[PDB]
Subunit: 264 residues, 4 copies
Amino acid sequence: MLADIRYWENDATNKHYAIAHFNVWNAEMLMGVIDAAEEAKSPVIISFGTGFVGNTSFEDFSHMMVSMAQKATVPVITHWDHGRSMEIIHNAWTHGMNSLMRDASAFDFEENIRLTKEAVDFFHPLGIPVEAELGYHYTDPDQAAEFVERTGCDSLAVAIGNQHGVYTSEPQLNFEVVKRVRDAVSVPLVLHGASGISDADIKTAISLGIAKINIHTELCQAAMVAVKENQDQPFLHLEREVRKAVKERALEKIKLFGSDGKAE
Amino acid sequence: MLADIRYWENDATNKHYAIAHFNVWNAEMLMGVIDAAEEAKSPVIISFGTGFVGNTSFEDFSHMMVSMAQKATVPVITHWDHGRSMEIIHNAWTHGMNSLMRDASAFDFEENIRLTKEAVDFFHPLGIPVEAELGHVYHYTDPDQAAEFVERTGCDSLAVAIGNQHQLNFEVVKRVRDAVSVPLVLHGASGISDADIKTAISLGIAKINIHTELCQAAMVAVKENQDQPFLHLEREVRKAVKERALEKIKLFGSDGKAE
Amino acid sequence: MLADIRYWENDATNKHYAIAHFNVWNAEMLMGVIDAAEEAKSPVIISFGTGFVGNTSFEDFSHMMVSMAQKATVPVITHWDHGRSMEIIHNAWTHGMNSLMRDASAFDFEENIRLTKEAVDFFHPLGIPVEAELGHVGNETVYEEALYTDPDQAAEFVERTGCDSLAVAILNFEVVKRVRDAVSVPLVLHGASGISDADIKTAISLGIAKINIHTELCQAAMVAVKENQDQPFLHLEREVRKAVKERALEKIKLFGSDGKAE
Amino acid sequence: MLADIRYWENDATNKHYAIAHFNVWNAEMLMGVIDAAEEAKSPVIISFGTGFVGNTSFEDFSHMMVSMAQKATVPVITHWDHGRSMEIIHNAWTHGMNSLMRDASAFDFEENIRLTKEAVDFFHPLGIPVEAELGYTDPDQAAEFVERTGCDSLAVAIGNQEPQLNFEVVKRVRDAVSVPLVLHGASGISDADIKTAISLGIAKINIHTELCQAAMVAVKENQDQPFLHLEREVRKAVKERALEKIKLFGSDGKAE
Ligand SMILES: [Cl-]
Ligand SMILES: [Cl-]
Ligand SMILES: [Zn+2]
Ligand SMILES: [Zn+2]
Ligand SMILES: [Zn+2]
Ligand SMILES: [Zn+2]
Ligand SMILES: [Zn+2]
């Protein structure tokens, strides 16, 4: 069923688990993620973003995202990740994304506030929540508080020692930063990128207030193992294996983040 | 735009070309086919059937098929292939397929007629065309049976068995063409030679179902991209499907025919 | 269920009945007509046209029309009446009308053909049928006209346009006879109000397969409005729906389309 | 455009206006209300409920409600009024109502909580707001009811059904509760008393049968006219009455 990310991130915060965010841009990725969330009885976020528009017609594929979200027996949030403009996130909303992210973190602090608040002020009247982002430079607790209070954003992606994407040496999460940002900010905390982080450290960060974690690369890599294994098989067989591989990886992330069982 | 297969198969029959029927069951196959038909300014048929339901949720993927069909600038027919029950083709129709095949070709002549006519009599009042099959694709079509079959069922088009298989006997096509006037359909045309396809079209084949060849084109891209990032591999699959669909559209003579 | 007017007008022709075309432009009119068709087990045509766009938002109301047509257990055709332009009938198609009339009958013969054929050539590739109209194109002297559709002109018109059905200007049964003999498509009657029951039945026996109801539902509704003018609005509007049902049932039965959906 | 009643009730609360809720169950009622809201540049609530399901096919009419709500240039909330069961409001939600009322006010306090909480607990994970009703409403029961149910707004009994309002009830409930207050059964309350009630915290007012009454005046005025004209006059009468309520309640201009 189409789910509200405010309710579910609140639940995750309060019960000390995190919701997995999966970027899905084709049929097998979408089906594999929904298979995992049904099997685990877990809320889940399915996301599209501008990085996939060269691969897949969002305006058409969104119909399949929304249909599967509606028909699922578990909570499914349809999300637009890393929104680069008002028109892009408006187009996401008109095509049935019920959760949006406006990423203005590349801009100076005041311009990040202005652009984020613009999105909030447009979408709150429509009932649509807006995730924002504020950027080793750790997120500062007092700046995070000011940012959230001033924008009215519904969730905040933070820098806690995690790498947004690729890493050199093992990221070291600063758990004191997590605690202090959690205490300063009234909305749920989000991580964009958790690669290279140990299971024990992910679990600690979740226990201290991380309520949503974006999986950016791992489904693609899990899929490619199935592609490579099945490169001499019929296409139909290869795609059945790609779906299963995606399901297995999504299930691993759901169990690691503690969201299994939380739908019921 | 959602298009009427009766209009387009008539056009094809009268102008001596064939409409390509492509089996699509995931995002890249669908997108690649639509890419080809847009580029070639061609009518096209996009098809799903029971052989794909283990791979893809038709009830959800149908929304993407219908969306792309409606928004395309070329004629797109949404077709349910090899329908072995009223229930499955009724499900297809409620999910936006605007052309149906009722395939009762596994049965004896009388029972094929009764089952086919059942589908025709349900769907014609709803404006939905029904393709039928006489011959199993093995059992070759008999021309005198064909005349009677089309007359009794009222089917809109007839899939024939002329050596085509999911050898090739052009005498059979020739005799069937003189026994019935409805458009003729060729299943299992992946791996028939270019010259034999042109011959079949000149003798009255007006729709040609391509299944395996898109799967083959995809797997070529897979083997060429097996060490690549998944996003890139999938762009290459879509591109490979487009190029193979384009090849078939031009072979069949449907390029340009949308204008 | 959304139904094909070609199939049903062919059925009507071959079994010597006519399908009722009801103009509906609000909720109680739509619901009464569907109530009638369901009770009578009859195909029915529900129509909107330009004459109502100032009363009701077509683009919004169309959604209720299509929904009711889909969910009905009887055949329901969604039809755009008297289409005055390609833009108007295109707008009708994108809002779920599955049957169109392109009415170019006010123009000279060749211009009627050109405008009608334009609609047919656009909409046949999309599977959408087009009803056309040909009135009296007079070969007679101006003096004799002081003292109506020609069958030969009708055959040329249908052949050149490819239209799926033809509205004809006819009470004069010769004209119905001669046009029926000359054209291969179903015949349609507009402006039948006040034709006697007996003559309607004769027109249908001779080849009329669809009959457009004019203001009869409107008048049926206003009898209920008058009767309920001191009642609460919810009660009044229920009686309007019932009055529309009753008038619609009367036409369906007169036309012989009751039972024809089975 | 389809609007969130929580946002708009919050706006009304903070700016001391109320949003009109209009019960609409046919084409002319819906169009006249949307006409008024557009002309006044006002948020509006359009509502259906069980009382109208025999007259009008909700499952079909809902498509026209939703289409008009989406296309409107002003905020339009699609609301199911006086929801009598989980099944009924679930059906409302599946046909595009984005705001629900669960009315368990027939029942004593504990049972009203339980039934209301059942609705909140089902619909909040779907992002759907639930209005409830309690009731004079007692301010301590109001605070406890809101806290225990998690409902998003509360319909209160202040002397509404010559109706004399107790304004002290509105003030004390406003102060005890953190959600917006709603008034049902406003008929016959004076303009001055409505304004006073809004000033003290009433943020949404349900228009009971005043559109129906306006429509019937058009009916009596047009009994000898053709149906197309009568219906133009009904739509115009609805528009006029809805505009009068929007202006009384102060929501004119609040959409921009
Ligand atoms: Cl600010
Ligand atoms: Cl038979
Ligand atoms: Zn980011
Ligand atoms: Zn086949
Ligand atoms: Zn007429
Ligand atoms: Zn006319
Ligand atoms: Zn109440």
